[PDB]
RNA sequence: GGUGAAAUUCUUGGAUUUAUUGAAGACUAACUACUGCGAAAGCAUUUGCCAAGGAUGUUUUCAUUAAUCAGGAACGAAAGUUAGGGGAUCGAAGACGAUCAGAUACCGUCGUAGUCUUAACCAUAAACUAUGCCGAUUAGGGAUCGGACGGUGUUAUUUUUUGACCCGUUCGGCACCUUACGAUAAAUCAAAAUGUUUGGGCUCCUGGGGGAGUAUGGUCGCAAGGCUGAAACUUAAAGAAAUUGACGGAAGGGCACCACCAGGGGUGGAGCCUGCGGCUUAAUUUGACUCAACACGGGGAAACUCACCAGGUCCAGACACGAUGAGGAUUGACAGAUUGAGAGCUCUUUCUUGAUUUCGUGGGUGGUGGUGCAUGGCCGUUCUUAGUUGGUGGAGUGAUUUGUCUGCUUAAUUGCGAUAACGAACGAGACCUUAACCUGCUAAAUAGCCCGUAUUGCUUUGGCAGUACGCUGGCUUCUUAGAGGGACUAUCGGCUCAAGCCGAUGGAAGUUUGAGGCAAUAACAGGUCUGUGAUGCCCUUAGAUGUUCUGGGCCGCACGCGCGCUACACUGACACAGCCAGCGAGUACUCCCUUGGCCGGAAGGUCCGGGUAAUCUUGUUAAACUGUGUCGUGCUGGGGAUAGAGCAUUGCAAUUAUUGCUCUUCAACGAGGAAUCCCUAGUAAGCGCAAGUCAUCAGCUUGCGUUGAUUACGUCCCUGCCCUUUGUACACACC
């Protein structure tokens, strides 16, 4: 079968995680590429790098894949990370909605202040 | 009926099967559980009776009454014994039927004791948790059984109790799950912990393996036997738990035409070569004996090769010492006769050299002599499959293990991924050679084409391999050969997260594009001492196991085997005609490849010449094959074995025919038993050619081309291989 060699698929990640954006979806263009960044001086090696830095571009165009950055996915989570909604889910906006027994709790850490709504506790 | 398949057996007297009923004896399915009771052995239908038991609860009683126990006693599965009853099923022994070499067994049909019960014995089980009884302490957790307690809500009853279910606490059990502060040699253990920091109480047993739980004595038993229980003698291990391999008629997964399936062509059925043993001895020189010996030693031996007799040769015994020795000492070669002899070896004479030499003592050289079980080197094989190894880290006391893997994928330890491993090195792949593409580049009189010149034959009206190196201006499609490009699964449709897989299109090429070369760790007592002045040791070294010469032998022939050639014909044989390749080789002290002319029936002979080679042999005009005829279903014009005669060639020599040609002779063989080999596309098969060997001989091998298929594209059934789990009493490793 034609199964590739971890020695293509290592390079040629190594192509896409620096050259993304020199690269492109295009074979015959991606041929040339491989000429002037690469040191091959074999054609059927350079070629099946070519081809599977190819499989992998097309990929990319849909999300995929894990671990080949593609430093233009870093700069993406960046903005991801720093993305937070400004109204915060723990805020109260029946306030705060709590059993017996947490109820009881506050008592006892002395901070009965809070607008608790005590709801009863059953089993089913 | 019964079985892998059968048979013994029953059956038209109705077997087996169907329905109903009856009798007999045994047993108590499903419910049935990591559940319960009992001191253990053991205990599973209902009901009644009889006696007993643990746990629980207790603000009841006694007050040390307790624990363990040598002898002693009760109970004690199954089998077995005695005397009755019963006797359905199953079933020791026994009888048959199969299987098998045997089958006193496993398998099947019968079948006695027994299996069941009352009375009485027996007292042994892998009677096992292989783990004595009592007591205290020590990590967590959830189930479950019995009792008790507290709470909650449904459900059935109820003058609000009880049962079922739910949550929790506690006592007492059967166990279980994770962990190691601990233990052990380890497997593993909440006990096998609290033990070299060694003492809570009691009882029993053991002291390397056998002999041997045997002999004897005692005692119990109706008996079978039980309990108690040695010694002589023998032996360096036996044994326990794990580790890595190997093996498995163990399981899971995956592969191979040196495996199979579907097929194709063979071999095994005479004769050829000795390619392999007896026989002759000078010998039929010798090595190799499953794959991994037997057209192998490139081993197609007339002489040589040669290693297997005779005859000679060796200061082809270097060098050192001594003697013959300075009256010359030493020493060899000729001629005739004998002696094969062409060594004067013998009868004689000539030269002769002077320690170049001849003997003796040491020491060397040579040996296709032995040892491949002393070795190097080389090759083959394990093993053509994908496997192997450190470093740091982790586990284990250790051998060692993980890394190197559950799953998917790949031809692949190939990748995607998971992950106490991370990062790497080999092998695979990658790489190199070769085949297929380029009307793109480079450039060719040692390759071609077009153009033109001269000329030939028909037409004469334009067409012919037409023919002709300095006959030629241009070009490189064909040919040659360098650089390059080209395929990377490209695109499309599907499955899938991925790795990838399938189909179609385009493309010269889509199985890794086809075929090779190289090819890892470890090893074989694999082969080679007969390749080597590559060698260790042993043997021999003047009547040689050195060397050379003649002849013979390696070929000898009742017999068995292996690799092959030719055939058993009509899809053919023969005669003419048509008529197309590729890989290659070729001349110096002597002829290598050979053209053309001449002679001959053929093999051949002769003469002038070409080629040290894209130039000449050579377009190697190969054969198979196609066309037209003869033959005719006859072992026949198939087949060419054996043999007779003659003629040439090579060689110094052809006899046991070297080989070639002519005529004649015309054997088995009509498709081949049990068995067995190779092979998936320009492949099998058929057909030939060149090279190696070579003065001559190719039925052999290495390559090349021509014609050119049937059938899978799958599997683990046979034979083997790779990985994992598992078992092992194996490690010389299932021979
Ligand atoms: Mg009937
Ligand atoms: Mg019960
Ligand atoms: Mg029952
Ligand atoms: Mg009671
Ligand atoms: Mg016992
Ligand atoms: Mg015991
Ligand atoms: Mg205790
Ligand atoms: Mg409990
Ligand atoms: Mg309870
Ligand atoms: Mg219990
Ligand atoms: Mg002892
Ligand atoms: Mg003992
Ligand atoms: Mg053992
Ligand atoms: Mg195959
Ligand atoms: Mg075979
Ligand atoms: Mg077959
Ligand atoms: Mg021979
Ligand atoms: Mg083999
Ligand atoms: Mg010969
Ligand atoms: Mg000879
Ligand atoms: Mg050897
Ligand atoms: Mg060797
Ligand atoms: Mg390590
Ligand atoms: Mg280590
Ligand atoms: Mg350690
Ligand atoms: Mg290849
Ligand atoms: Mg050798
Ligand atoms: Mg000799
Ligand atoms: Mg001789
Ligand atoms: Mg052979
Ligand atoms: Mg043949
Ligand atoms: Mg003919
Ligand atoms: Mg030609
Ligand atoms: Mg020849
Ligand atoms: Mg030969
Ligand atoms: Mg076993
Ligand atoms: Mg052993």
Same mark, same amino acid.
């Given at each position: 079968?034609?199964? =590739?060699?971890?020695t293509?698929?290592? #390079?040629? +990640?190594?192509?896409? !995680?620096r050259?993304?954006? @020199? ?38 165009? =849909?999300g995929?894949?894990?671990?080949? #950055?593609? +430093?233009?996915?870093? !700069?993406?989570?960046?903005? @991801? ?29 002395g ?14």
């Open positions: 079968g034609r199964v =590739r060699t971890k293509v698929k290592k #390079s040629a +990640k190594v192509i896409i !995680e050259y993304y954006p @020199k690269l492109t979806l295009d074979f015959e263009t991606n041929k040339r590429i491989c000429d002037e960044i690469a040191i091959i001086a074999s054609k059927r090696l350079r070629n099946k790098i070519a081809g599977y830095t190819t499989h992998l571009m097309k990929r990319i165009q =849909r995929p894949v894990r671990g080949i #950055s593609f +430093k233009l996915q870093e !700069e993406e989570r960046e903005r @991801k990370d720093q993305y937070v909604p400004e109204v915060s889910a723990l805020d109260f906006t029946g306030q705060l909605d709590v059993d017996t027994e947490t109820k009881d709790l506050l008592k006892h850490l901070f009965d202040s809070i607008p608790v709504n005590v709801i009863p506790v059953t089993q089913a």
